[PDB]
């Protein structure tokens, strides 16, 4: 499986991968993170199709295989309309489950705030409703880092030497501590990371790296709006997640009846560290709200 095509959304060509499930019981749309990465690192969710869950993957504007629109359209709100236009173009009036990871999570929340009427359930993994809070929390993680790496981030970071050999070394430690904690990073993840460093979305919207959000979404925060979401919601976050469970908590407190699951020994990309347990939890939640 997985039909791969080029859907023309909002005037531009958007790449998507739809993996159908035999006796389909539901359609799950997924939102990769970054901003500026690609669907690739989310391919582990493809296992849910064996659970009767069709999964829709797709590269957001300017990401991966999709073309980049005008820079003025590098916004969360624009991504929201893109998602809705794509869901409509491919599924029409059918309601679907929406899953978002990291930035994709934040994008999913903003989507739900406006288009929750097109959803059956919402799933956020390592997502966030507030970038500022995410920054504040990540800084703490930096302070808990060993002296060298902590100073490297501050010195080189404040000067902008992200290319420095020491700074990089610090970034690596942090990553293997809050991004992905397991050995042998799967090719799907590497490709998404490579996709980020190549396109322009990550550098313009996000910033230098994972813990450095100096881009255009630096002030984004819809913590006050996500409380309007009245659909079944599943929130997951790794124990050592770069987007700490503290950020997940805020989201959890606003969405009435939402479930918060903190994966132990996992971090950001929990779908790879605990693939079986992750996919099982997501499929269980989905099938519970058919």
């Amino acid at each position: 499986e997985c039909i791969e095509n080029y859907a023309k959304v909002n005037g531009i060509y958007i790449y998507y991968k739809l993996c159908k499930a035999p006796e389909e019981k539901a359609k799950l749309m997924t939102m990769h993170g970054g901003p500026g990465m690609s669907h690739d690192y989310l391919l582990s969710l493809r296992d849910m199709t064996k659970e009767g869950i069709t999964v829709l993957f797709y590269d957001q504007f300017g990401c991966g295989r999709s073309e980049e629109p005008d820079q003025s359209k590098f916004t969360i709100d624009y991504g929201v309309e893109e998602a809705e236009a794509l869901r409509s173009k491919l599924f029409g009036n059918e309601k679907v489950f929406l899953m978002g990871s990291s930035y994709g999570g934040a994008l999913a929340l903003a989507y739900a705030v406006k288009y929750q009427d097109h959803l059956k359930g919402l799933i956020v993994s390592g997502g966030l409703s507030s970038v500022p809070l995410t920054v504040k929390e990540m800084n703490r993680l930096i302070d808990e880092l060993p002296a060298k790496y902590r100073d490297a981030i501050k010195k080189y970071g404040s000067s902008g030497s992200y290319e420095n050999p020491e700074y990089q070394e610090a970034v690596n430690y942090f990553y293997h501590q809050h991004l992905l904690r397991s050995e042998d990073w799967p090719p799907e993840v590497l490709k998404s990371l490579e996709y980020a460093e190549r396109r322009n979305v990550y550098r313009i919207m996000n910033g230098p790296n994972q813990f450095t959000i100096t881009g255009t979404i630096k002030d984004w925060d819809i913590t006050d709006k996500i409380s309007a979401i009245k659909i079944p919601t599943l929130i997951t976050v790794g124990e050592y997640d770069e987007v700490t469970p503290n950020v997940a908590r805020v989201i959890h407190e606003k969405i009435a009846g939402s479930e918060l699951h903190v994966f132990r020994d996992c971090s950001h990309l929990t779908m790879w560290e605990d693939r079986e347990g992750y996919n099982k939890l997501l499929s269980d939640f989905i099938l519970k709200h058919l």
């Binding site: 990089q168 970034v171 690596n172 990553y175 990073w185 993840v189 590497l190 990371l193 980020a196 460093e197 990550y202 996000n206 230098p208 790296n209 994972q210």
Partner: peptide
């Protein structure tokens, strides 16, 4: 963002 990275890796190596």
């Amino acid at each position: 963002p990275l890796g190596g």
